[PDB]
Design a protein. Structure first.
Lengths: 203, 249, 218, 376, 49
């Protein structure tokens, strides 16, 4: 059986949080084959827990581990602003390393906020050829989930559209980028395209 | 395929039942310079059934692999792991220097240098009682009269044969005429009766004509022997019928 | 003091049998198991395989038994991850690791720096810039200016304003993956409508892989 | 299975007509009973009070112990460092939520077995159990039987049936009995509870019995050859009926003994003192090798010296030296800075082991050292 | 399918071989013998042969 972990977890500074892990294995050597690695954004991971009732040398005491049945637990006595990182439980019982699925750790950030919206007509340098792009800019929203839609002359459009909403930086608010392609004749032959956010309803 | 076995004094017995073991699938693992079976051959396993099979696992320092056998004597045979003279099993071993050793010196395996007396077969004495050779009570720590028995092997990759760590597996099974739980990948043929035919029950072979007599066995009986210890009754492994074996014309 | 160092970034085409390295020092490389770990973008860690530099003893992950070959040179204490018939899907970050003075033999206590790998079949296409000029029919309020960058495969594609000036008021949005494999991003800058064309309001796009300097106004 | 046969066997059984004990404890603070190579158990209570047993060496946490106890409709067996209290009882929060106050703590727990059919035997009287520990295996037999006689063990034959054969690997020498208090209220953890709110014990012995088998396969008679002459003759005649005469010259008379070995001792002394008594040893580069032979095996002179900081034998055990016969011995000696001892060993490395004192892989001996800051 | 050896391999993985010298020592005409030099055929006298 493959390891499994919660999709993510939340907390705040000073609070004691815990992370779980299920799907371990066993052998004649015992049942303490669980290790947690903390990988910061864009850099090599680091070992945090091994032999859950123990840990490597020099490891801060802010972390603790324990196991119960086929489920393990990673206890943290207190979070910090720099503790935002991924954590993976891994089993090495039957001479086979099977890392975990990974679970995200975050803390409370900025409260909700309304999303920004802005639209422009096709550029003057793209209409001169058979390649035109429709882009809509959205950002300044805290929730990490949003979908963009397009429509022209009250006729929705659901073809050749792509959108992503990754975290830009530590601003604490996500940003979405949507794109749409079409021919120049399709623009001049219809009304100006409009952008919709559908973040909290009509827009 | 485990990562780390246990010590010789705290060997971990792994009971195995309700399965079919194809012992041929063990040879494809690490080399077996010693696959000795003292009660049977290393080939007749996939043709016989077993009542209760266990697997003992422990690491030793190589030069003591010879002590894992009937009638053997030594530190391991006397204080850590002893086998009876009527043993019926197979012993396997192989080198694990790249697994159970470290250049910085590993100190997780122990061998119980001393003890009051010789440990009995299939027993375990993981107790940390400090031995006392004198008359005065010990002060809880090693002294002139009491010594720490739980010594250790400082395995290192630089060591030579006879000192490098070897893993040992002791597979024991009781071939008594008792209910079976492991038989192998053998196949099963339809039942024939009232005619002279060869039969291969759970380890029992022979010739005869079955008749399905009225012998009422008990929940723990599977075979019946006559005055000459010749089996004359058998229980079906796939049903609850009691067959009676008789010699052909 | 123990330390590890792996090969630098790599960007090539499929078919080639790439071979990255993982060199270490400060320890008896001959008696410490070494291995590699796979991690695709947005995905977690995945065990690749381990090697015992003392000899040719090497254990590989079941799913990566032959997809790659791991080698190490005991005479210089340098591990290697040699590929064979690379595929476009093999792009991912790869970390090498080893066992420390504590834990099981495959605990993977210490880790390397990592090696980014991109083996797509797309050359270093240059970006195309289009000015996202403001709507002259709705100049009310604050006017927003920007440029649309599109049709560039490599990551180093970046955008700037006034060749380095105008640091404030600029907002660069994440890029998006296109169906053709290329990428595109959009940046804008909001300024008063009465201050249109202050000094230049010019965009600046750079690309070293293609070596294309695109300075276009808007 | 066997039918219509008179079989002769030899195993740890219970001698017939033995002096069994009837325990009526009610009274707590009852010491634990011994385990003389097999014990017997019996009771006729229909209230299902006695529902467990404790087994083990010294019945403490310092050594492993075996615990058996029935449940509502199941059983639990474990081998752990149980700290059996002076009064092990099964508390109940009354008819539900029982508490395992029989012990205080148990950590290792190197074995667990939950059969959940082991001893319930319904609710409507006699039940007999036989326990045995042999070759690491703990055997148990059981037989539920009715009761239609006065308050005592009834006559007849009730040959027991196998119950379980599981491994414990314990040097069981003492055992006891468990029972649920059920004082109508929960009881504290303290021992010696309210007993105010009845079994048998028998110890097995090595014997030889002549067993009978019924046509149906069940035993219906037996004979203890070592009970009376009329029984040792039937075992040889292999018949439960003995005709008139001297039909058997049963056996002969013998008397056991015990003594020691390895006379004499006054033959000679040993120069062992010559190597242990000295004001200064040789340098590490010139380690000494004192040849010893033609003496008496006695290393007790080493026990009266100061404590040895390091005592690492790589051959056998250090105590067996005072027992084994050797062909020659070389007692080397030298001095180091204390921490360099880690290099004086087979397989080790270092300047010392590489250039001054190297030992072969087949070395056999002991490495002994002690502090000498005041003398050296 | 074929195996493959490499010098860098460790003990056991190195290549080994086998040879089985089947013999037949019954009373039959001999084709192979040892280096025992042949002596003279002394006849008509009690001797070892």
């Amino acid at each position: 059986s493959a390891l499994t972990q919660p999709p993510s977890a939340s907390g705040s500074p000073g609070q004691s949080v815990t992370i779980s892990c299920t799907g371990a294995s066993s052998d004649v050597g015992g049942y303490n084959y669980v290790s947690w690695y903390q990988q910061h954004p864009g850099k090599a991971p680091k070992l945090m827990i091994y032999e859950v009732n123990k840990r490597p040398s020099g490891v801060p005491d802010r972390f603790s581990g324990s196991k119960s049945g086929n489920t393990a637990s990673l206890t943290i006595s207190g979070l910090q602003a720099d503790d935002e990182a991924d954590y993976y439980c891994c089993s090495y019982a039957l001479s086979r390393v099977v890392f975990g699925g990974g679970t995200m750790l975050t803390v409370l950030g900025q409260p909700k906020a309304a999303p920004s919206v802005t639209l422009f007509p096709p550029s003057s340098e793209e209409l001169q050829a058979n390649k035109a792009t429709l882009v809509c800019l959205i950002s300044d929203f805290y929730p990490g989930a949003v979908t963009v839609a397009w429509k022209a002359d009250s006729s929705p459009v659901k073809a050749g559209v792509e959108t992503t909403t990754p975290s830009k930086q530590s601003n604490n608010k996500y940003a979405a980028s949507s794109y749409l392609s079409l021919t120049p004749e399709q623009w001049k032959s219809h009304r100006s395209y409009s952008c919709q956010v559908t973040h909290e309803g009509s827009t | 395929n485990a990562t780390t076995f246990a010590s010789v004094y705290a060997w971990n017995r792994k009971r195995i039942s309700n399965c079919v073991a194809d012992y041929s699938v063990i040879y494809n693992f690490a080399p077996f310079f010693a696959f000795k079976c003292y009660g049977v051959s290393p080939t007749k396993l996939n043709d016989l059934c077993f009542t209760n099979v266990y697997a003992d696992s422990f690491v030793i320092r190589g030069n003591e692999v010879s002590q894992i056998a009937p009638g053997q004597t030594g530190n391991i045979a006397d204080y850590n792991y002893k086998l009876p003279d009527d043993f019926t099993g197979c012993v396997i071993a192989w080198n694990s220097n790249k697994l159970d050793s470290k250049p910085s010196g590993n100190y997780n395996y122990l061998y119980r240098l001393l003890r009051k007396s010789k440990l009995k077969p299939f027993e375990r004495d993981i107790s940390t009682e400090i031995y006392q050779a004198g008359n005065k009570p010990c002060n809880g720590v090693a002294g002139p009269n009491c010594y720490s028995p739980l010594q250790s092997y400082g395995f290192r990759p630089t060591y030579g044969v006879g000192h490098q760590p070897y893993r040992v597996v002791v597979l024991s099974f009781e071939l008594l005429h008792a209910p079976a739980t492991v038989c192998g990948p053998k196949k099963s043929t339809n039942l024939v009766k009232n005619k002279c035919v060869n039969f291969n029950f759970n380890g029992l072979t022979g010739t005869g004509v079955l008749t399905e007599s009225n012998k009422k066995f008990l929940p723990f009986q599977q075979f019946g022997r006559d005055i000459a210890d010749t089996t004359d009754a058998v229980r079906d492994p796939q049903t609850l019928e009691i067959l009676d074996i008789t010699p052909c014309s | 003091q123990m330390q590890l160092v792996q090969s630098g970034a790599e960007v090539k085409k499929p078919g080639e049998s790439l071979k990255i390295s993982c060199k270490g020092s400060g320890y008896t490389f001959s008696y410490y198991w070494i291995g590699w770990v796979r991690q695709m973008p947005g995905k977690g860690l995945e065990w690749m395989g381990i090697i015992y530099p003392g000899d040719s003893d090497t254990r590989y992950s079941p799913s990566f038994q032959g997809q790659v070959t791991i080698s190490a040179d005991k005479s210089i204490s340098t591990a290697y991850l040699h590929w064979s018939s690379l595929k476009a899907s093999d792009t991912a970050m790869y970390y090498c690791a080893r066992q420390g003075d504590l834990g099981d033999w495959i605990l993977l206590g210490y880790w390397g720096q990592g090696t980014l790998v991109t083996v797509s079949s797309a050359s270093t296409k240059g970006p195309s810039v289009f000015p996202l000029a403001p709507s002259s029919k709705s100049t009310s309020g604050t006017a927003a200016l920007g440029c649309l960058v599109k049709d560039y495969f490599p990551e180093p594609v970046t955008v700037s304003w006034n060749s380095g000036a105008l640091t404030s008021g600029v907002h660069t949005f994440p890029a998006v993956l296109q169906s053709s494999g290329l990428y595109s991003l959009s940046s804008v800058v909001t300024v008063p409508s009465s201050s249109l064309g202050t000094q230049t309001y010019i965009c600046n796009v750079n690309h070293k892989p293609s070596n294309t300097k695109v300075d276009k106004k808007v | 299975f066997r039918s219509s046969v008179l079989h002769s066997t030899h195993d740890l059984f219970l001698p017939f007509f033995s002096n069994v004990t009837w325990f009526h404890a009610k009274r707590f603070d009852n010491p634990a009973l011994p385990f003389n190579d097999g014990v017997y158990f019996a009771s006729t209570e229909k209230s299902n009070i006695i529902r467990g047993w404790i087994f083990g060496t010294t019945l403490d946490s310092k050594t492993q112990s075996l615990l058996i106890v029935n449940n509502a409709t199941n059983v639990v067996i474990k081998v752990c460092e149980f700290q059996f209290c002076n009064d092990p009882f099964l508390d109940v929060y009354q008819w539900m939520e029982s508490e395992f106050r029989v012990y205080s703590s148990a950590n290792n727990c190197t074995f667990e077995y939950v059969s959940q059919p082991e001893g319930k035997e319904g609710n409507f009287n006699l039940r007999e159990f036989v326990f045995k520990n042999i070759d690491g295996y703990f055997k148990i037999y059981s037989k539920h039987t009715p009761i239609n006689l006065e308050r005592d063990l009834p006559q007849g034959f009730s040959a027991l049936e196998p119950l379980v054969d599981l491994p414990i690997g314990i040097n069981i020498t003492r055992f006891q009995t468990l029972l649920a208090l059920h004082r109508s209220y929960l009881t504290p953890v303290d021992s010696s509870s309210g007993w105010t709110a009845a079994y048998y014990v028998g110890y097995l012995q090595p014997r030889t019995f002549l067993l009978k088998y019924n046509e149906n396969g069940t035993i219906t008679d037996a004979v203890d050859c070592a009970l009376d002459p009329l029984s040792e003759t039937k075992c040889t005649l292999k018949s439960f009926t003995v005709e008139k005469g001297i039909y058997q010259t049963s056996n002969f008379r013998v008397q056991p003994t015990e003594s020691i070995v390895r006379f004499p001792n006054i033959t000679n002394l040993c120069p062992f003192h010559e190597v242990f008594n000295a004001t200064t040893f040789a340098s590490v580069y010139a380690w000494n090798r004192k040849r010893i032979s033609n003496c008496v095996a006695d290393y007790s002179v080493i026990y009266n010296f100061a404590p040895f900081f390091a005592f690492k034998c790589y051959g056998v055990s250090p105590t067996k030296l005072n027992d084994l016969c050797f062909t020659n011995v070389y007692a080397d000696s030298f001095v180091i800075r204390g921490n360099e001892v880690s290099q004086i060993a087979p397989g080790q490395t270092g300047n010392i082991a590489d250039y001054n004192y190297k030992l072969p892989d087949d070395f056999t001996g002991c490495v002994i050292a002690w502090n000498s800051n005041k003398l050296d």
